[PDB]
């Protein structure tokens, strides 16, 4: 069992994109290996008997030892044609349903392999059906629909409200917020690292409060290091850094008592940097002005010369007072005052009546409406010594400041390490504190796919909601792999569904989770359909072609259709497909009742529904998941809750039982 | 029922009397605008909900007023307010609810919830009086703080204006009680806490006393005495303990303590006085 | 002939909010008069026999001459209770369905009027059914759903792509882009002003090209005037202003020939400002540095004194060259160069081999590794005259610059007027050019509601489409007031609908429109429902209670339901209601076919549908509106366009005719 | 059919010959990637679409090859490319279409559209010789500019990369022709334009000539001569006009003109030469 395999590859100056093909079977995949060893490992793996390359390929070192090589022209690897070509092959108007739409580096390779295949085979090839992506970050990942829809870091309207962030992010520092938000975009699936995080997160719960405020002192050390590296760093940035360095002995002490070797490792990563603290302490005032431009930054006592040039301008005011007083009493003019002007320098002003009663030492620099100003050599002498000393003290200050960049940069990587460590600790501690604040539990990992939730809760909705969340369990497995969910509106369909999503993600950053007890097997891929028609359908197919035996599939109201039957038919299928062939762990939210016949029709499918207690003027939504199926029409009831006038509600129910009197 | 603190304290203890382990307490605006109590104590059936508040509706119904001594406290509140009771019984039922005058079902766990807008709704003045905003919470904050040390077995969450303020976890039976002691009285007290365990016959004295040697101006604010659960501020005990702080070290400064006494019914009798005294002094040495 | 009316009002320091009530009928409205005369006119109009006010009302002058006054407490006007109260009165969870949800200033007034009414009547009042907003700008009303949905200035993903703006905004200046985008947010409905704009827009089409580039020179004059007013304006901002002022004689000439008195009026508003040009021209260099801080801004020839202090530092380089040259000659050391240092001042450096071959005039200031630097008295005293003169020249420069703010500000309003005129002209010309570029037509206004389109086109989609749009007409009136639209997906339902919207808006800014000929009567309000359940319903009711006999109602796929009949019933009603009672000009996009029985059921309703031509195993979408109704299920067909595997498509069609074999 | 400029010019004139008043011409990437021609000239029936490109399919069909002299130009392009014809006839019909693998109906107005992607599906070099593209558009820009002055009755929109570049409006018959003259030749020529109207028997000369007195380096780039529509390559007329610019003012610098001549044939015959000359000189004075 070693096959006849074909491949194509093209590169831009960014990285690589790759595609393959077997003429015996008709198999077609894509990828975008970013670096060299990955690209070499991908040719090694697939091992094409025949390999395509564009004339101008740069990293030839990969392919010149390989067999059955095929030099091709450039124009054949153009995305425009490539996309156009392959789209009419599969027949679609886009490659949305394939899950590769914006991966063009790979698509030139798929595009050139098809023009070659058209021309290698030159007959119809309908044993080539599709194309799918394998995924760079294989601690596997979550589509764009899920992301925009789950609002983990951004909501409906585009703010940060009702977010998983809004809850979890009570991180004290901005570098905590980012890394907290990043771990959400990229869940960790090396089992080892997940458990490292749980051990750390649990051991901190006794020290939640003691540590928190210490980190709020730091500020964004990370971004400060940036302007340091760029050499655009400003005084008050270096100031909050110093304040951060002063917390290091404190944190070193508090963490040494904590029982977790991963904590002891991160405690080292933090570091101390005693000498770096010392320099900043000796060089700079407590909190100087905003920029360095107009000085006032370096403290006296760091540099002798600094204080020297400062002593020239410090012989200023008393010099001019003695002048003002001597000259006032020598001339006999009391309106005589020695003042400064930005424009002209210093001067001696006398009021107009007394002005021509002044001595002949005085040289006119400035006539006024109400006075005459004069200059004298003693002042004009002294004018210089001040103005210049200022400049050169200022100049020394600029010099000393930018020299500090030279002094810190040799440890620049060691500081980034500490900055990364501290950012991560804020995240860990915040989470230790969110499990302390909101009572989350520590889960465990199992062998094969399955989720068990014991009285779990939607971690966002419960915090925003009037009443406490109606906690529900969930029990899924390879034996019980699908749940047909029917019921009333505001029944909690989409809620019971999307809540499930949050459980996984949370467990898979090593954090504790909103439930009594949670056990979980492998779940690689997390796909979603988000209500609204071109649009609706297209994404559905993606989830089909890519989702696996171990994935999580998230369906709500597919078949917002053009007719009675389309919707139903459509659905009927997709469900049977996920139970019959794919065998993934699925949750299927629907309104089209006939599907509830599927637990009997299929092995592995079982009925559930959010039961409603519908009574008189009002109606009750248990917000509880019940074994069985939905009753009936719940829309007519919900109608008024919008604000429907009864002109309509009664025309609705008057027609409803014209219709419901047939069935 | 004059302050929000008083309406809080009583309706917090209605659930305690119903055997409660979890109590959510939520406020907005010093108590003026919102007060929300949720409990896991046993519930109120759909018959008992209506007439506990609505007063000629009692006439025909055959003394079912019986089940509900909170019903006494509720009735007074309800005539001149915007009250909302909602509850599902421990007995397999659906949840039922009372507003403002509608009774209908809604949804809820095993227990009871009470939602309210500023109690007096047609009394011009008694509202106009209702003290500040800030201070009313600071009083409520104490109400919970008192009942908290009285009951280590009930989890209480106090929040203000949507935001969590105080989270008192119930300590497991036979558990680490130092957790809850630091949460209520700050960390400063916790680290100077010298426990006490004295016992003569029927009488039994348990608790903590801050070491006088390291008792500072911040710590001196903690003086609470409970007897079989109930705090009385009877001046007798004032002596017993200020005698005890004088007798270890002569400097008579303000002490820090929280003590628990367990005896058989005898409201206040000198027996109790010297019992207290001897317990504390041994502990300080 | 006359009434019995009740009212309530409250104010914050921002403005007023107002509410009313008649106990005979039970009528309940809202408003937020912003200023005093509007508030006085609103009490004058409604003329309550009984009027409520909170103890602490500030503008008492409005109410102390009025009859049947009622002083009320403050707490009764609190929004929290008010909202809570009124919500349980109507029974809803929110006031979304009333179209007043975010108008809280008015709602305190409505809130207090209900606690009073509860207590004035204490009797049954279900003759009080609803609340609705009248809108200050009788000129316009387009709801939030329409706005976020129509993507006139912003698309779904949050960019500016596929927008009406992306097309129309070929405006040359940023102040054009804004005002262009603003007129879209607020369509003009004084018929006079609309026709003024058409006359202007048509007369410019010969001068499209000639004018365009002249305006791109201006830049954002408007925002420059801002930092001028704030006194934060910078050199290069004043520079682009000057460049703008130089175009004014040019524009004055080009527009004098154009035939439109509205153009001649706007030509005056532009102005000239000859003296203001003169000052900037004489005071500033062509393009100075970024800020004024480090000088080099004011040109020589503006100020004698400026050039005086510049003459001291102007005797710099030549002074030091003659020194460098004389001393190089005199000593015989050619590596001798006279240089400057920020730290130490000027010096004379010689290379190490030649260093001890220098004369004894030289005083050591600075030893180096590979040279020796020296100072001499000639240099050290010349050092001063430069460094100080610089400063005082710099100081004069700062003074002169901020004084210019004093000189321009007396015309500040006249300049804003020109800035507004120019911004508006770019918009007008841009639109004159978009009608020139995209061949739009000039419409006319009629008496009573109705739209007639002759071969009209969706102005966005046709530009993003690689093809000309399938232009279609439209014919609506008070007689033909509703169109039931059924058909295939990608039929162009939502397209034929949303296109209608754009026509109105465009016509109602006085611009030409994408069609052969367009005539239109009054349309006040423009409401919309945007595919995706709690969500979908609530907004529906709004449109009901607010929409009028003259409005435009925009329905697409209402009744994405929980069951067979709910959706249908629901819709059935809404339609009948808009035809039977409201009588608005409507377009109803649906997928529930039974509704197509409504042309027979109602007067004023007529069937239309987007017809599709299915040939074998491909399908054609005519993109053309046909009289009659839809065929069938078009979803099974669209399925594959996603990329559906045939495991499923054939299970679909295998079940489809199990279902379709009953009906 | 070597350059994109050539394929453009020919297929632009296919529609003119079909009596066209509106012509859309759209390009991307120097012509390499995209070329789109839409016309309002008469259309192509559903029978005539197939065999104009596909070549044994002509045999059985009874000389309907007749209607389609563009069909000659199309056939050569089609065998080695990615072509898309689509058209609805002025007569009895729905729109029909041909691609790349399919004939089916789609939609279109009265006329014809032609869409295309880069030719040579397996020829390595002949593509290498398509120019640096920038220049290819600058050539196409001239193609349209030439045919534009030849036909004042046809509206032409030239665009590049989706974006409008040039819009030549058709002047109403007996209308203001100064509007189109400025659009094609810039405003500089327009304002120096001195019209010409000369007439001897069968021969008739109409047009414009930039005043030599105010003819600058920018203006001298405009020299185009048409005879009953058609621009020829004849050195003769060079003399007639450089004789005319020399004879008004001696300074023999490069002129600016666009002239229209209407006769019965004298292909190059001296008759035509002095007729031209005398027309221009009178106009300059
Ligand atoms: N288990 C629960 N406990 C408490 N509240 C809940 C629960 N489930 C849902 N809710 C609330 O009910 C609201 C609506 O529920 P949702 O899941 O959106 O209904 P649905 O069945 O998807 N139908 P619709 O939303 O109308 O299409 C949400 O805003 C939740 O805040
Ligand atoms: N008159 C037209 N001319 C050309 N293209 C059109 C026309 N109308 C619609 N389209 C295109 O057809 C598609 C359908 O538009 P739309 O109105 O959203 O369809 P729909 O009937 O609402 N069903 P769906 O889009 O599946 O929900 C879009 O891709 C448009 O670009």
XYZ file of N, CA, C and O in Angstrom, chain D residues 1-3 6-8 10-11 14 37 52-53 55 70-84 100 114-121:
148
model
N -3.863 39.470 -34.558
C -4.246 39.559 -33.124
C -3.018 39.354 -32.228
O -2.969 38.391 -31.444
N -2.036 40.261 -32.337
C -0.807 40.166 -31.525
C -0.936 40.861 -30.161
O -0.789 40.223 -29.123
N -1.201 42.164 -30.186
C -1.342 42.981 -28.974
C -2.798 42.972 -28.467
O -3.705 42.617 -29.223
N -4.828 45.583 -30.527
C -5.376 45.112 -31.805
C -6.703 44.360 -31.647
O -7.654 44.622 -32.397
N -6.768 43.442 -30.673
C -8.005 42.683 -30.396
C -9.107 43.659 -29.958
O -10.286 43.486 -30.316
N -8.714 44.673 -29.183
C -9.598 45.780 -28.786
C -10.161 46.504 -30.005
O -11.367 46.490 -30.225
N -10.379 45.972 -33.238
C -11.225 45.184 -34.155
C -12.614 44.891 -33.563
O -13.639 45.122 -34.205
N -12.638 44.384 -32.335
C -13.904 44.023 -31.698
C -14.711 45.263 -31.260
O -15.937 45.162 -31.058
N -16.490 45.990 -34.536
C -17.550 45.004 -34.838
C -18.943 45.524 -34.461
O -19.936 45.290 -35.152
N -16.328 43.751 -23.674
C -16.985 44.632 -24.628
C -18.471 44.403 -24.579
O -18.921 43.290 -24.809
N -20.154 29.982 -34.850
C -19.233 31.125 -35.052
C -17.845 30.909 -34.397
O -16.904 31.610 -34.713
N -17.761 29.968 -33.448
C -16.540 29.643 -32.687
C -16.109 28.169 -32.820
O -14.936 27.891 -33.077
N -13.753 22.675 -36.418
C -14.819 23.656 -36.679
C -15.974 23.043 -37.553
O -16.783 23.744 -38.206
N -17.710 39.579 -37.651
C -17.020 39.435 -36.371
C -16.754 37.950 -36.116
O -15.710 37.592 -35.578
N -17.701 37.097 -36.528
C -17.520 35.640 -36.515
C -16.217 35.132 -37.131
O -15.685 34.103 -36.702
N -15.699 35.850 -38.131
C -14.331 35.613 -38.662
C -13.274 35.916 -37.576
O -12.428 35.064 -37.270
N -13.352 37.113 -36.988
C -12.441 37.538 -35.906
C -12.560 36.694 -34.624
O -11.558 36.448 -33.945
N -13.783 36.263 -34.303
C -14.047 35.445 -33.112
C -13.408 34.051 -33.199
O -12.729 33.619 -32.254
N -13.608 33.375 -34.336
C -13.142 31.993 -34.530
C -11.642 31.796 -34.222
O -11.250 30.787 -33.613
N -10.819 32.756 -34.656
C -9.363 32.714 -34.439
C -8.995 32.823 -32.955
O -8.122 32.097 -32.454
N -9.695 33.719 -32.264
C -9.464 34.002 -30.846
C -9.812 32.754 -29.993
O -9.058 32.374 -29.091
N -10.912 32.092 -30.351
C -11.597 31.092 -29.500
C -10.937 29.726 -29.266
O -11.084 29.146 -28.178
N -10.243 29.211 -30.279
C -9.681 27.846 -30.207
C -8.623 27.689 -29.108
O -8.496 26.621 -28.505
N -7.902 28.778 -28.839
C -6.786 28.791 -27.895
C -6.998 29.794 -26.735
O -6.046 30.512 -26.338
N -8.214 29.844 -26.180
C -8.513 30.804 -25.102
C -9.712 30.450 -24.182
O -10.335 29.377 -24.309
N -10.000 31.394 -23.274
C -11.071 31.302 -22.318
C -12.140 32.371 -22.587
O -12.186 33.391 -21.914
N -12.977 32.130 -23.598
C -13.902 33.133 -24.138
C -15.343 32.990 -23.647
O -15.813 31.882 -23.446
N -16.044 34.112 -23.478
C -17.455 34.105 -23.104
C -18.295 35.079 -23.906
O -18.276 36.288 -23.667
N -15.983 29.595 -21.925
C -14.695 28.887 -21.967
C -14.328 28.375 -23.364
O -13.151 28.260 -23.763
N -18.870 40.526 -24.588
C -17.778 39.560 -24.749
C -16.800 39.680 -23.618
O -16.184 40.727 -23.431
N -16.655 38.593 -22.876
C -15.782 38.543 -21.713
C -14.639 37.545 -21.987
O -14.871 36.508 -22.614
N -13.414 37.855 -21.536
C -12.213 37.038 -21.848
C -11.112 36.996 -20.762
O -10.818 38.020 -20.133
N -10.493 35.818 -20.576
C -9.254 35.654 -19.784
C -8.033 35.228 -20.595
O -8.184 34.477 -21.575
N -6.851 35.658 -20.094
C -5.513 35.581 -20.741
C -5.325 34.354 -21.639
O -5.536 33.207 -21.239
N -4.936 34.624 -22.871
C -4.897 33.587 -23.885
C -3.589 32.800 -23.779
O -2.730 33.129 -22.954
N -3.471 31.753 -24.599
C -2.333 30.805 -24.600
C -2.414 29.798 -23.422
O -1.724 29.939 -22.400
N -3.234 28.751 -23.556
C -3.375 27.819 -22.432
C -2.196 26.838 -22.329
O -1.950 26.256 -21.265
